[model samples]
Target: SVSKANVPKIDVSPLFGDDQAAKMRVAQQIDAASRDTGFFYAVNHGINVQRLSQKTKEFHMSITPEEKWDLAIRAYNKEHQDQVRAGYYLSIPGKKAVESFCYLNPNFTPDHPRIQAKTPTHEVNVWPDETKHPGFQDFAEQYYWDVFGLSSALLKGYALALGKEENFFARHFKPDDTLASVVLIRYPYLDPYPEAAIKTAADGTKLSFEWHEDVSLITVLYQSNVQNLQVETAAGYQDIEADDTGYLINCGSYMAHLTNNYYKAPIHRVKWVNAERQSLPFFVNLGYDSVIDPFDPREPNGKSDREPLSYGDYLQNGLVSLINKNGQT
Candidate 1:
């Protein structure tokens, strides 16, 4: 059974407001949700998801008469739509419930050159071949940086919500030692429209995801207008309906660890539902050498108890396990 106290819907506009009273009110709301459910939907931060999604795939400039459509952009959208209908995927058969499509996945250090010279996993991306999709690399890179701007603001908001000065978290981005990796994923739902949204796998389809937590300092998410995303709790699960208005920001394990557990790392999963779903999750990492600690110098108490570790070591382990533990694409 689900918790009677499910994840709350938090209006985060106050995080950006000038009033300390408004910021404190929202902070209390955040504290309540984090301590209870570890998840909450943050609204009113302001982002255009459909428009942002277009930037990731805007190179498709033309359509043939055979490909004519009532709406030009709609066809490109539908082409990818039908592709999902066809179910192109990378997961092995057992992992089919979480079908995966990855794009523009790359790792970056604020000082790319430093790591480029010493890192062992310094590798290539799954970026589409430019021949078939001309100019793809540059645009995917553009989308990643563009979203960074949004995540930057969101991170500052999170800092305020966590009880530190607003600039406390954003200042971490200035260090040249951290690495941030960007990836775009689409989970093609097993569908029969709204009916499938609530069906159990006993109905024949598999559950979309199991319990999991993100590994970054912050995870900036765009809902893609798809529904049936859910948050997990000790009590049970809360349904997360998609809203196109703004991001659904959440604390990752690293974020929770950084706060010495003051802010709960959100536990969430996607159960295969009626509509196709996708995400552009910005995994904002902290510097490699930095140690995890309470952002508040006062050493506030928290529920989670974790050991000491460096960001580089923590992130490395998270990557290897992320793919296997929950099969994060």
Candidate 2:
């Protein structure tokens, strides 16, 4: 028997207010959700996801396959393709039936210090030609900044939850040069779905993702209509309901690493839902050079003795595993 996921709905409005107690209440809820479920529905995140998703659909529909390839990250060094941003990707023809358009902070220009210095994730975004795709670039930039603002606010909540000062994370995030990314994924419609341990579409392509966790600090996801996602807990794999007006917030591997496993990064995966599916997720990260020193709120000293590592190194290592885990792309 499949069980519903225990994800809670958290109103994060207090994080935007000036009241300390209200912010702490929000923090405690975030703490409980991070500790137990590792996922939550954020109701007052203040983004108009409906509008943002419409833009996502427009880009996916209007952009041709040729144009997608022209902008593919694979055109860059294959060894380090998208170590910071994934331009475009499609699953193996007979494998997972999904494609994605990913981009990093749009503010990074070709002349930016990081871009000029050839930083890993600070590469300039590859956008559609302005004359051909009128407002797509503007929309993408707006969306990035809006989501980045929300992610930064959520970090404060995370800070208070960890028993630190509200601004503890402020220094770690550089607004102009953070390594955060946004991914727009499309799962093609599968008709005449076939039965197997791995569901196959009528077109001979698979329809689900292999189980894996994200590599960021937190992922803010806007799920489209399909309710096929599941999270693994002591109760087994449980289904997660799709929310229309709210975004799903989940901790990731980085969060687990930073918290010394105090904050769970619940293992999750997508099941075949037999429909055209789309999702826009923002993978929030700290500034590339920020040092990661694991800490546990429950510990006496509240800090780990492990060697410190830079966020950029941690992210690059995690990204490589996704690319070469089994030597099958």
Candidate 3:
């Protein structure tokens, strides 16, 4: 039973060090935090401090929607963006989020042509000319690689909580072995009823995302301000606040399924839009074909292991469902 609470914040610096005492303490805190809601913060965790802070803010803010349009159809060989549509807007995306794109790190992208052929989602990401955004591609990739290190180390902490060796996950994950998809999203303000007779608060006029569970083992979220971004609790929806240095961590469906429901993904959503908000979410997806359900063996009662599921099938199905529900192909 995942409890609802303000996503707890814990120091993960201990896990980065060799101090046994430090590691154990933070690990225990993680266990307790997830006992109710899987939403919590990990402080002192090593990552680029710019999760959604000034460093990140400047980057996304520098690129205006006008420029986004200029570049949307700037590079791809297709005649128009409609031919290969990857957009950023309030009325689009798998979820209700404003505008976003998925990317793979330049440091590495999986090379298994056999598996890549299975789905176009696995197709290589397209890059806009550097002239459009200057070092835009490199700027975004640097942050992604930084977050990857943070997510990898945190996975070890999950291993400890499950009573497995610290490096248990390390055995399965490698830097370039996975797609390491990086999601760049922004929550632009909206006014669904701009001309309506009745209205809500003036500042509270938009929603960028609805509540949903993540498919990865874990997810790292970076936001600079408190905004209207929120997490669910037993009491209901509440805003989640974070400074630039730390990231908001959530145990996802993948982790819960691995632990057989012992750990849970936080149920969260984007509420009324607050300013021009943006988030850079780094999912811990090793690869489309990565096998899951290994943690069932860690059960104290010796429960049967979950049948394995591959990431490609899992993600593909999830995408179809969301798009279909919108009643649009």
Candidate 4:
């Protein structure tokens, strides 16, 4: 069925306006896509993709890895105990070939209560040195808020898709305090190795980035170049078509937990195409202390007798899993 299932390209502009019928139609399409391949293209989402694309390109092109390390969370946390903050390289050293720069919600001021209280996952983002990287903060902040708005709008569609009121998730996400983070990722070209060596990989995937599920409720991704993303579907792994104007969207693990497994948390990976690739993906999470006890109707009493967990606790564990443990995977 997946061979026949083209990733639905849904125009979500209607979600920004107040047309009940129009919004619901988009919701239905999203629901179908969510149930099928758990991946789709979102167009007319009101983002200045062209401008942002150029900005993203310039940022990646100009910044050196050493400059990026200056802002690396690993260096900031030195002991490697603190799991949350801006991280420059996500891959295990010398093994995986991916570069990453991450930042948390920028709306929070140092005086914000959560930051002052030293809440977990609520620390300030480690920004690039302003003197060295002029205009980087400005561009990064603008992009963050822009995608935040789009993610909020998409949440409404997801809510409606789940048979809840459009604003049902409003309480879980805060414009200023959400723990959502954006990651700028780069996959450098892997020198062409023998195709025969790559073909021996289990599942026939030449994984440049190992398969994993994201922890956010949903991830909105803008791929600037190359197309190596593949999602596991009923019909096996399917390549995601790249389109410059539309963002590729997918549900994450948190969404699956919130929706009682009604919506899928797709397992995806990057294949080695031996070409450089860049992507900007926003990981839209819930507020730090938001509780998701009864996120679904079927679980009126809660998913289990176990105590409900806060989003912050959930995030801490998820993030730690991605980082290498003392240089070990």
Q: Give the best candidate by TM-score.
A: 2
Q: lDDT (0-100) at residue 229 of candidate 2? A: 83
* Candidate 3 lowest-lDDT run of ten: 193-202
Q: In angstroms, how far off is 57's CA in candidate 2?
A: 0.7
lDDT of 2 by residue, 1-329 (tens): 67898889999888888999999999999999998868899888899888888888888878886776677776333644643355776444454556788888776787788888888857777877887788998998899888887887888899999999987775587667788888898876754433432644333434376567788888988888788888878877778898878889988888887788888788887777677778888988887788867787779889786566788888888877866642222
lDDT of 3 by residue, 42-97 (tens): 78876656533554455456766555554352132244333222333222433343
Candidate 3 residues lying further than 4 Å off, grouped into runs, are 1-4, 51-97, 107-120, 190-206, 294-299, 324-329
**Residue pairs clashing, model 2:** none
The regions of model 2 sitting more than 4 angstroms off are 75-84, 91-96, 192-207, 326-329
Scored against the true structure, residue 195 in model 3 reaches a CA lDDT of 30
Model 1 per-residue lDDT tens digits across residues 182-298: 555555545333332233533243455556788888776775777656676665566676666666667888877776666768777666654555666667776666574545423
TM-score-best of 2 and 4: 2
lDDT of each: 0.57, 0.78, 0.61, 0.76
**Model 4 ranges with Cα > 4 A deviation:** 1-5, 75-83, 90-96, 190-201, 295-307, 324-329
Q: Which of candidates 2 and 3 is the stronger one according to lDDT?
A: 2
TM-score for model 4? 0.87
TM-score of each: 0.69, 0.90, 0.78, 0.87
Question: What's the CA error at residue 61 for candidate 2, in Å?
Answer: 1.1
Each candidate: RMSD: 8.2, 3.7, 5.3, 3.6
